[PDB]
Write an enzyme that holds these catalytic residues in place. Structure first.
Site, short mmCIF file in Angstrom:
data_model
loop_
_atom_site.label_atom_id
_atom_site.label_comp_id
_atom_site.label_asym_id
_atom_site.label_seq_id
_atom_site.Cartn_x
_atom_site.Cartn_y
_atom_site.Cartn_z
N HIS A 113 36.83 42.49 44.21
CA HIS A 113 37.08 43.85 44.51
C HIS A 113 38.21 44.43 43.70
O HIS A 113 38.07 45.52 43.11
CB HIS A 113 37.42 43.95 46.01
CG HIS A 113 37.68 45.36 46.48
ND1 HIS A 113 36.74 46.16 47.08
CD2 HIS A 113 38.81 46.10 46.43
CE1 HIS A 113 37.28 47.33 47.41
NE2 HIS A 113 38.56 47.29 47.06
N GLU A 114 39.35 43.73 43.62
CA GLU A 114 40.53 44.33 42.91
C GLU A 114 40.25 44.45 41.43
O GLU A 114 40.67 45.43 40.76
CB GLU A 114 41.77 43.46 43.11
CG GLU A 114 42.26 43.47 44.60
CD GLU A 114 42.34 44.89 45.19
OE1 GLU A 114 42.05 45.05 46.39
OE2 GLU A 114 42.72 45.85 44.46
N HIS A 117 38.55 47.52 40.51
CA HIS A 117 39.46 48.61 40.26
C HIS A 117 40.21 48.47 38.93
O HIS A 117 40.42 49.47 38.22
CB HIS A 117 40.52 48.57 41.36
CG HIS A 117 40.04 48.99 42.72
ND1 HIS A 117 39.33 50.16 42.94
CD2 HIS A 117 40.28 48.46 43.94
CE1 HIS A 117 39.12 50.31 44.22
NE2 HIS A 117 39.73 49.33 44.87
N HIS A 123 35.84 53.13 45.05
CA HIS A 123 35.19 52.59 46.22
C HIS A 123 33.70 53.03 46.36
O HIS A 123 33.26 54.06 45.77
CB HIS A 123 35.99 52.91 47.47
CG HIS A 123 37.25 52.10 47.59
ND1 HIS A 123 38.40 52.56 48.18
CD2 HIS A 123 37.54 50.84 47.16
CE1 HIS A 123 39.35 51.65 48.14
NE2 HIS A 123 38.85 50.59 47.50
O1 LIG Z 1 41.03 49.16 48.50
C1 LIG Z 1 42.20 48.77 48.54
C2 LIG Z 1 43.25 49.02 49.63
N1 LIG Z 1 42.56 48.59 50.82
C3 LIG Z 1 41.50 49.51 51.35
C4 LIG Z 1 42.01 50.69 52.14
O2 LIG Z 1 42.98 51.41 51.36
S1 LIG Z 1 42.56 47.17 51.42
O3 LIG Z 1 42.51 47.24 52.90
O4 LIG Z 1 43.70 46.34 51.02
C5 LIG Z 1 41.25 46.34 50.92
C6 LIG Z 1 41.33 45.46 49.82
C7 LIG Z 1 40.20 44.72 49.48
C8 LIG Z 1 38.99 44.85 50.19
C9 LIG Z 1 37.79 44.04 49.85
C10 LIG Z 1 37.96 42.65 49.54
C11 LIG Z 1 36.84 41.84 49.22
C12 LIG Z 1 35.53 42.38 49.28
C13 LIG Z 1 35.37 43.73 49.68
C14 LIG Z 1 36.49 44.54 49.97
C15 LIG Z 1 38.89 45.79 51.24
C16 LIG Z 1 40.03 46.49 51.58
N2 LIG Z 1 42.66 48.01 47.59
O5 LIG Z 1 41.80 47.69 46.60
ZN LIG Z 2 39.83 48.88 46.92
#
Ligand SMILES: O=C(CN(CCO)S(=O)(=O)c1ccc(-c2ccccc2)cc1)NO
Ligand SMILES: [Zn+2]
Ligand SMILES: [Ca+2]
Ligand SMILES: [Ca+2]
Ligand SMILES: [Ca+2]
Ligand SMILES: [Zn+2]
Length: 158
Positions: A113-114, A117, A123
């Site tokens: 996921h990161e 980005h 998203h």
């Molecule tokens: O998107 C975010 C911040 N976050 C979501 C709300 O602002 S989070 O809660 O830290 C987050 C981070 C990663 C994931 C994630 C991880 C693995 C697979 C899918 C989603 C979901 C939420 N960072 O990338």
């Molecule tokens: Zn994210």
């Protein structure tokens, strides 16, 4: 928004979480980059010194950017879109407990996921997408991007 305008991209692991074996941190991050190079023309290489495009950092609370972490739970990690300096960097909250498996928060899945980005993706509203902004454990040995992740990355690269 921004994309990398080159094909060879570097990453560097700044520091290691004590939550995991070092080699397991290396492997999780390598596998996470491979998810994205499987479906784009990008090539990723780990460097051990100097300035990387994507710096992977474990940190807790306030850590020198304007995106303070919040202790265990809540915000798990965040990353910056392509660009110079901090652009591309991926930061993982050390107040989480990172693992190779279903316990704690799985580092591989989070890094997939990161790094999405770090490559310029936002998203997805599709719960099936790895870019959907809620973490859920799925079996990492058979993990696959959704159609939506694929169309998203391929809109930016390739
Ligand atoms: O998107 C975010 C911040 N976050 C979501 C709300 O602002 S989070 O809660 O830290 C987050 C981070 C990663 C994931 C994630 C991880 C693995 C697979 C899918 C989603 C979901 C939420 N960072 O990338
Ligand atoms: Zn994210
Ligand atoms: Ca947190
Ligand atoms: Ca950078
Ligand atoms: Ca930790
Ligand atoms: Zn940060």
């Amino acid at each position: 928004g921004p994309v990398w305008r080159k094909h060879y991209i570097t990453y560097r692991i700044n520091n290691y979480t004590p939550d995991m074996n070092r080699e397991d941190v290396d492997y999780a991050i390598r596998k996470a980059f491979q998810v994205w190079s499987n479906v784009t023309p990008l090539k990723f290489s780990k460097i051990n010194t100097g300035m990387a495009d994507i710096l992977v950092v474990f940190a807790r609370g306030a850590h020198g950017d304007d995106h303070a972490f919040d202790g265990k739970g809540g915000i798990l990690a965040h990353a910056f879109g392509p660009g110079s300096g901090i652009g591309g960097d991926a930061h993982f909250d050390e107040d989480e407990f990172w693992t190779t498996h279903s316990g704690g928060t799985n580092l591989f899945l989070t890094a997939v996921h990161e790094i999405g980005h770090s490559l310029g993706l936002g998203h997805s509203s599709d719960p099936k997408a790895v870019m959907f902004p809620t973490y859920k454990y799925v079996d990492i040995n058979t993990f696959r991007l959704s159609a939506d992740d694929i169309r998203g990355i391929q809109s930016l690269y390739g």
